[PDB]
Design a protein around this ligand. Structure first.
Ligand SMILES: [Zn+2]
Ligand SMILES: [Zn+2]
Ligand SMILES: [Zn+2]
Lengths: 66, 604, 380, 52, 54
DNA sequence: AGGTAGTCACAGCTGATTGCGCT
DNA sequence: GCGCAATCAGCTGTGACTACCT
């Protein structure tokens, strides 16, 4: 059996996570099991780097007025 | 000066809040003006601020203006004096003018009329009332090259001397750095040397009050000064130029951007100036209607600044044209004046007054500052919100509706980064479905539709899929003209596609719906021009972007000019009745088939 | 010279200060200048009117199938005609509308000349799905209109409106003789074309005293119809014009009383649908006939049934309210409370009526001159 | 096919901005509108294709 | 040269169909660690999959 | 440890060539 | 055979992406 964290999101973010897995942008293949087109299963020891990558992707194409 | 919350606070600087709030204005120490629109004195305060400063944003409640040296030069150019402007600013301050503006205003306004530039007998001279300033600038190395041969003293009468004609731009750039800005005043009332023409506009072309204000500010004390007037394309822009040309009553030269804008200006002159066709000439190497010996000449850029070999007839026409003075040289689409070859155009012809007209003064590369000395100060800036409130400008309901990225496309979008992702978010199936739904809806409600789409490679399959007319751009001259001519007066066809061709001042007919897809990156000028093609909720225009892509950032950063103008972009996330009818790319098979044909570019 | 080439206008020179704070008072005057932006007249045009027997002629040729106005000319024309009928009956209490349709070189009287608004709208809605065939015949429609309107009393203004879509008409006889006959009969004919100007329509409108117009778009069509809505001006005193008309009271029937007699409406009896068997309605003052709609002329005794409020709504034009004398507050020596709203008088100007010498504030003066149309003080 | 149509519609019409908006609507007012003024303002500010 | 260049790539770009390599992890025999832990190693990319089997 | 001349896409213009039409 | 219109070469504007020195 597999123990970790279930992540639910839109298919675009799921595919972004898949690309991160295949490109080894986090340094390893920790994105192990894919269950649904909109749900994935990720080991919980590196949820922080995934959050940082998601935030960087989100605010990259944002053009903050600050 | 203090940064307790990261905000520049000036509470201690301006405490003069005597009694008590009746003045709807706030001043800033460095420089800024905040105006309250919901005031009984709103019109008078607006008129006062327009004549002295240029706006930086005009929302519905609190306008914000900026104080600049060129704005003060324009203010002092009009009959307004230093004492009057200072006392009226102090009159409506509600907080007290900080002691950093009065000194700044005084310094800007002191050196206005000290140095003047004049044109006489095809010769450029610089005249100064005070002889000392000439010796002040004599030691400047850049100026000394203008005189030839050294212009020992040029004893006249008031001290003046000749300058090199082709180096006028350099001295214009230097003078402002020397705190001695030049002024371009043409006293056309009494010349007796220039052959004035018998142009006279018909007394049937009435003009709106804002055009009256712009013209009145152009001619403040019986003389015409070079300036820039910014008016929307739908509003009356050519009429202002025609009226200015008639008032100047001199030989007029009009410069357009495209080879079709010259015909537009000729039509405007024939409509509102009552000028015989013999005097009107167009010099664009198409008919050559004897431009030699003409009163009004109309031509375009990229023809007066050729660095290559020129046609034999064109060479003689240019030689004749460069041998006489010009009255009120009119430039169209002045925003694209600061170019590598367009700047020298003003140096290749000699004219007294240079009047520039445009609708979108915003431009990248921060070269608009150069336009302050290339032509003159920003004279008039029309308020678009109050313009559309009077009903003479269509109130366009702006919309920014985005579509999610399809799963078959987002993987490729995140996979590639070397400039190959443009087609991926340009040809988003969801955006295609949204565009098709909008087209069908506005055809069912019978609205004229213009669909702007750059990246014509995508526009090909975007337009042939719906089997609708489109303008590739490198097609021909007749086909585009006939398509645009039959677009308006034909009930069967009411939707057209334009690929970066309509990004200028053309003769496109009235339309109510504009849909832009995959435009340039941050071209605020392009989006403002596209919006200008609609106004003339009577109308409304949509912008389609793809989520989680660079197009979102581009749309966010390109709409700031319009929100400064006062428009608001409502976000639409769901389209009502999207699944009510059948649209293209309904199933995943054709969506995944699209990947092969969109990656089939392989431009390597 | 030119007006804008002289001196630049400084509109901000109006405001002045003398006590370093008086500017507020000035803007107060601006607020007082903000009000009174009207001419104290909701219409401001014709102060009287005259009865009209208007005939609307509708083309039914193939040209109505053109899609210049979405979806086609016929549909937009009938929609705007329904709007015109509603507005015309709203602004004319005792007028009448007849409808003629020209088709296949013939003229058919779609609806008889009457004052019922509902009947005409239903007839137009039924005629929406008609078949457009043949070519129009202005001669037949004009002959029918003249024949019907020939016997109308002279005081009534006889008007004919023609909506001419097709550019060609088939005339079985000379039309200029008909035009001369219409001119001798004092009939006003106005034409609103759809495609382009036609010589015969222009000549007819010029000779009969009417107006000929050509549609630019749907908005211009509606503007022309609205212009035709307004009644023509009438003389101060023309003739002995009087008409016998009744005023039916809207008596409903309740089972609590013993005088509840159900009855079928005379108008509803003539319809194809089942007549409404309602408790009660409008009873004719002459023959006690039951009707459900007003104003409807009685079918039995020929009397006209008109609602009194409709006639009374235009009485304020006969007796316009005289403008009150504007008096500054300081110069008035009296009570400082408004006679109408009982509010304290603080404005710089106080209005006093010339009859009752009562004081009204700006708001009360505007309300009286715009809506009330009667001085409350003079009522007492 | 018919199943492909439904799958594509499910993927498209509810990808990012529905998985939370629909849930919020399920947990929303539910009852009638606040005032008629709100409905009039919403109708004025809505686009013609969103009112059909 | 232009008219041959415009057609030389037409057949070049019509051959390839699948660009992305198949990432299906074909794990080999499981390796048993302590505490009933089982690790699977991908023979294509070296992905390690550690799981507890009941 | 952080910024600008080539380069690319997509349009414009003018200066020649260059095959097409013939009561 | 001559004349008009279609076509391309060369240059430029606009906006954005990218490889070596303070
Ligand atoms: Zn009766
Ligand atoms: Zn009152
Ligand atoms: Zn009274």
């Amino acid at each position: 059996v597999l123990k970790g964290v279930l992540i639910e999101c839109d298919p675009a973010m799921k595919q972004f996570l898949l690309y991160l897995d295949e490109s080894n942008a986090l340094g390893k293949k920790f994105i192990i099991q894919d269950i649904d087109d909109t749900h994935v299963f990720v080991i919980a020891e590196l949820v922080n780097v995934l959050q940082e990558r998601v935030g960087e992707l989100m605010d990259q194409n944002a053009f903050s007025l600050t | 000066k203090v940064d307790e919350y990261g905000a520049k606070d000036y509470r201690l600087q301006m405490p003069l809040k005597d009694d008590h709030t009746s003045r709807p204005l706030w001043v800033a120490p460095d420089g800024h003006i905040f105006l309250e629109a919901f005031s009984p004195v709103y019109k008078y305060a607006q008129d006062f601020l327009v004549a002295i400063a240029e706006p930086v944003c005009r929302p519905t409640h609190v306008h914000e203006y900026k104080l600049t040296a060129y704005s003060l030069y324009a203010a002092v150019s009009v009959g307004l004096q230093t004492s009057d402007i200072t006392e009226y600013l102090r009159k409506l301050s509600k907080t007290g003018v900080p002691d950093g503006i009065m000194q700044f205003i005084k310094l800007c306004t002191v050196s206005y009329g000290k140095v003047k530039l004049v044109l006489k007998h095809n010769r450029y001279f610089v005249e100064s009332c005070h002889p000392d300033v000439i010796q002040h600038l004599l030691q400047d190395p850049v100026i000394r090259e203008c005189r030839l041969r050294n212009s020992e003293g040029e004893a006249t009468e008031t001290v003046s001397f000749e300058v090199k004609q082709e180096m006028i731009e350099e001295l214009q750039k230097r003078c402002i750095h020397l705190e001695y800005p030049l002024l371009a005043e043409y006293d056309f009332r009494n010349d007796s040397v220039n052959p004035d023409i018998n142009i006279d506009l018909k007394p049937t072309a009435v003009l709106r009050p804002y055009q009256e204000k712009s013209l009145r500010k152009m001619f403040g004390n019986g003389r015409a000064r070079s300036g820039v007037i910014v008016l929307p394309c739908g509003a009356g822009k050519s009429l202002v130029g025609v009226t200015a040309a008639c008032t100047v009553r001199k030989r007029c030269l009009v410069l357009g951007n495209s080879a079709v804008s010259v015909e537009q200006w000729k039509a405007q002159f024939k409509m509102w100036s009552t000028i015989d066709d013999s005097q009107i000439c167009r010099f664009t190497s198409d008919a050559k209607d004897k431009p030699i010996g003409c009163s009004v000449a109309i031509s375009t850029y990229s023809m007066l600044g050729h660095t290559t070999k020129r046609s034999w007839e064109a060479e003689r026409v240019m030689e004749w044209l460069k041998t006489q003075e010009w009255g009120l040289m009119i430039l169209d689409e002045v925003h694209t004046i600061p170019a590598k070859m367009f700047r020298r155009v003003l140096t290749i012809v000699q004219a007294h007054c240079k009047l520039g007209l445009t609708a979108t003064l915003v431009r990248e590369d921060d070269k608009i500052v150069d336009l302050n000395f290339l032509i003159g100060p920003k004279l008039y800036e029309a308020n678009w919100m109050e313009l559309q409130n009077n009903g003479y400008i269509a109130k366009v309901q702006c919309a920014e509706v985005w579509c999610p990225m399809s799963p078959e496309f987002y993987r490729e979008y995140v996979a590639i980064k070397t400039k190959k992702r443009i087609l991926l978010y340009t040809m988003n199936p969801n955006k295609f479905r949204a565009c098709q739904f909008l087209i069908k809806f506005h055809e069912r409600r019978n609205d004229k539709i213009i669909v702007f789409a750059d990246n014509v490679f995508a526009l090909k399959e975007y337009a042939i899929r719906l089997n609708k007319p489109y303008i590739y751009g490198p097609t021909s001259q007749g086909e585009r003209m006939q398509i645009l001519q039959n677009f308006k007066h034909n009930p069967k066809i009411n939707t057209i596609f334009i690929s970066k061709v309509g990004d200028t001042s053309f003769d496109l007919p009235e339309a109510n719906v504009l849909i832009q897809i995959s435009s340039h990156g941050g071209s605020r000028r392009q989006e403002a021009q596209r919006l200008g093609r609609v106004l003339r909720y009577n109308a409304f225009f949509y912008s389609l972007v793809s989520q989680d892509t660079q197009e979102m950032a581009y749309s966010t950063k390109r709409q700031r000019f319009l929100v400064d103008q006062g428009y608001s972009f409502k976000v639409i996330t769901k389209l009502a009745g999207m699944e009510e009818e059948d649209l293209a790319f309904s199933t995943k098979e054709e969506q995944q088939q699209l990947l092969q044909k969109v990656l089939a570019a392989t431009d390597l | 010279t030119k007006r804008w080439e002289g001196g630049y206008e400084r509109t901000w020179e109006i405001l002045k200060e003398d006590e370093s704070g008086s500017l507020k008072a000035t803007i107060e005057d601006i607020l007082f200048k903000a009000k009174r932006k009207r001419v104290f007249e909701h219409h401001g045009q014709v102060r009287l009117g005259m009865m009209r027997h208007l005939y609307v002629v509708v083309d039914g040729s193939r040209t109505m199938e053109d899609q210049d106005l979405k979806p086609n000319r016929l549909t937009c024309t009938l929609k705007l005609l329904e709007y015109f009928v509603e507005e015309y009956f709203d602004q004319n209490p005792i007028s009448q509308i007849g409808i003629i349709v020209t088709k296949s070189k013939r003229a058919e009287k779609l609806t008889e000349l009457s004052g019922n608004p509902r009947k005409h709208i239903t007839s137009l809605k039924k005629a929406v799905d008609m078949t457009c065939h043949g070519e129009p015949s202005l001669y037949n429609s004009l002959s029918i209109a003249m024949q019907t309107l020939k016997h109308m009393p002279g005081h009534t203004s006889r008007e004919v409106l023609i909506i001419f879509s097709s550019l060609t008409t088939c005339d079985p006889s000379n039309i200029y003789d008909l035009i001369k006959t219409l001119k001798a009969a004092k009939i006003r004919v106005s034409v609103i074309g759809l495609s382009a100007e036609v010589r015969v329509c222009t000549v007819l409108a010029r000779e009969t005293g009417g107006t000929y117009h050509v549609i630019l778009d749907e908005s211009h069509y509606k503007e022309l119809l609205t212009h035709h809505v307004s009644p023509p001006p009438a003389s101060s005193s023309s003739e002995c014009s009087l008409i016998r008309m009744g005023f039916p009271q809207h008596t409903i029937a309740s089972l609590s009383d013993q005088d509840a007699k159900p009855s079928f409406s005379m108008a509803h009896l003539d319809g194809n649908t089942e007549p409404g068997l309602t408790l009660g309605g409008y009873f004719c003052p002459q023959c006690r006939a039951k009707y459900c709609e007003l104003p409807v002329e009685c079918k039995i005794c020929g009397l006209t049934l008109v609602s009194a409020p409709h006639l009374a709504r235009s009485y304020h034009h006969l007796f316009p309210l005289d403008a009150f004398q504007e008096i500054p507050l300081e110069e008035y020596n009296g009570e400082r409370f408004c006679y109408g709203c009982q509010g304290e008088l603080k404005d710089q100007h106080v209005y006093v009526c010339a009859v009752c010498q009562n004081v009204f504030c700006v708001d009360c003066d505007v309300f009286v001159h715009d809506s009330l149309h009667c001085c409350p003080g003079c009522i007492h | 096919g018919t199943s492909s149509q439904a799958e594509a519609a499910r993927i498209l019409a509810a990808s990012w901005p529905q998985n939370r908006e629909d849930e919020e609507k399920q947990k929303l007012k539910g009852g009638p509108k606040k005032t008629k003024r709100e409905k009039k303002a919403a109708a004025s500010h809505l686009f013609p294709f969103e009112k059909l | 040269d232009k008219k041959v260049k415009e057609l030389r790539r037409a057949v070049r770009s019509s051959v390839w169909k699948r660009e992305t390599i198949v990432h299906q992890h074909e794990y080999g025999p499981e390796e048993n660690l302590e505490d009933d832990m089982y690790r699977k190693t991908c023979t294509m990319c070296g992905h390690e999959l550690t799981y507890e089997k009941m």
